[PDB]
């Protein structure tokens, strides 16, 4: 149901960290599921989901992931560390489902590293990601090391190197400052 990797064209088209970006109607979600216990850190599952940014939340990458995880990684007692590399942050409805999921599964931790911020409404801007962070999720902007890590593991790079966008650095700086404001 998830793929192993996306092709290079897809990665470049969807993970460019322009704060204002039109036409990227999908969310791509790269995940690593690890069994984590202090210094032990076992890679357990990896893959890629694609979903819609809009339409009903059943079509969203985050619910694609959650439905797969509950059906295929649970039931289990392990301590899971879930890492996402996402092209957009989650919509407010998926924030609510993810926050509820985390509150009911204290053995799961989630980190979301995003290429871009979802365009939140006035009401959701200082609420949605704040609620998710308060439920214990770590929400951050994807930095260069994470883009390179994604190129290596979630892209059919076929030997090529990751070539970052010319505005990468100032885009990152603007996004990091905006998220800091969103989270207090």
Rounded to 10 degrees, what is the CA torsion of 14, 168, 18, 16? Answer: 0
| 94 carries a ligand binding annotation | yes
34 is an interface residue for Zn ion by CB under 5 A:
no
128 is an interface residue for Zn ion by CB under 5 A:
no
Indicate which single residue of 60, 98, 110, 118 sits in contact with Zn ion (rule: CB under 5 A).
60
| Least Å from the CB of residue 97 to Zn ion | 8
34 or 60, CB closer to Zn ion?
Answer: 60
91 is an interface residue for Zn ion by CB under 5 A:
yes
| Least Å from the CB of residue 129 to Zn ion | 13
Strand pairing category for 138-141 and 26-37: unpaired
36 or 97, CB closer to Zn ion?
Answer: 97
| 86 contacts 59 by C-beta, under 8 angstroms | no
118 or 149, CB closer to Zn ion?
Answer: 118
98 or 155, CB closer to Zn ion?
Answer: 98
Q: How many residues bind Zn ion (CB under 5 A)?
A: 4
Edge-first strand order for the sheet with 40-52 is 40-52, 26-37, 80-88, 108-116, 138-141
Indicate which single residue of 82, 94, 137, 141 sits in contact with Zn ion (rule: CB under 5 A).
94
| 91 carries a ligand binding annotation | yes
| Least Å from the CB of residue 58 to Zn ion | 9
117 is an interface residue for Zn ion by CB under 5 A:
no
For Zn ion, the binding residues (CB under 5 A) are 57, 60, 91, 94
């Amino acid at each position: 149901n998830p793929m192993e990797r996306m092709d290079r064209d897809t990665f470049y088209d969807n993970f460019e960290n322009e704060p204002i970006l039109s036409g990227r109607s999908y969310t791509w979600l790269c995940y690593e599921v690890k069994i984590k216990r202090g210094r032990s850190n076992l890679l357990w599952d990896t893959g890629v989901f694609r979903g819609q940014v809009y339409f009903k939340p059943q079509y969203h990458a985050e619910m694609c992931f959650l439905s797969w995880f509950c059906g295929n990684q649970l039931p289990a007692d392990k301590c899971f560390q879930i890492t996402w590399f996402v092209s957009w942050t989650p919509c407010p409805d998926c924030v609510a489902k993810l926050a509820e999921f985390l509150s009911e599964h204290p053995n799961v931790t989630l980190t979301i590293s995003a290429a871009r911020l979802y365009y939140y409404s006035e009401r959701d801007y200082r609420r949605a990601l704040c609620r998710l962070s308060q439920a214990g999720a770590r929400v951050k902007i994807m930095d260069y090391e994470e883009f390179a890590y994604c190129w290596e593991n979630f892209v059919d790079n076929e030997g090529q190197q990751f070539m970052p966008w010319y505005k990468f650095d100032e885009n990152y700086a603007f996004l990091h400052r905006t998220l800091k404001e969103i989270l207090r």
